[PDB]
């Protein structure tokens, strides 16, 4: 009846590593969200801790 056209556009924060990386005045680098244990996104690429899980950007892994 009615053409339902929709596409989930992306909304990026101002360089969203500031949501990940926190450094205080002493200079230690504190990352709040989860680092993915998979090797293709290891030690540089982080997951995002959600309300019931975490979510990777590459291998899309979940948690509880």
């Amino acid at each position: 009846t009615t053409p339902k056209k929709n596409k989930h556009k992306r909304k990026k924060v101002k360089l969203a590593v500031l949501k990940y990386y926190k450094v205080d005045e002493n200079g230690k680098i504190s990352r709040l969200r989860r680092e993915c244990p998979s090797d293709e996104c290891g030690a540089g690429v982080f997951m995002a801790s959600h309300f019931d899980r975490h979510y990777c950007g590459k291998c899309c892994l979940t948690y509880c």
């Binding site: 500031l18 990386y21 450094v23 680098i29 030690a43 690429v45």
Partner: protein, 123 residues
């Protein structure tokens, strides 16, 4: 040593594109140092975010990165080639990114005679 050191970051960031050794961006520039293979990194002084410099210098400090101070954001991004040049040579649209890193130097001696000698006197 014939040329100025703030105009000596030209050709090393040219040859940062011949292997795409320039990790352009900021998140990609953050993850460029997370694997610990980058040789040099520079930063623009023109920042709206003051704590952004505190984020990037925290990783540049403890992972032995020497820095070169450049004043402007949009001036820095043209060494990637991100300025949209015209057919007669005018950058009609310039993209500036404040985190320019390198992964490979050039194959010469006219670049590391002034950059590295300016690096030795700050040790």
């Amino acid at each position: 040593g014939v040329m100025d050191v703030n105009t000596a970051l030209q050709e090393v960031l040219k040859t940062a594109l011949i292997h795409d050794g320039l990790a352009r961006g900021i998140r990609e520039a953050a993850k460029a140092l997370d694997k610990r293979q980058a040789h040099l990194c520079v930063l623009a002084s023109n920042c709206d975010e003051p704590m952004y410099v505190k984020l990037v210098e925290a990783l540049c400090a403890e992972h032995q990165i020497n820095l070169i101070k450049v004043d402007d954001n949009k001036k820095l991004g043209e060494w990637v080639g991100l300025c949209k040049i015209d057919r007669e040579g005018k950058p009609r649209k310039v993209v500036g990114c404040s985190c320019v890193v390198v992964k490979d130097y050039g194959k010469e001696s006219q670049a590391k005679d002034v950059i590295e000698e300016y690096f030795k006197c700050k040790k």
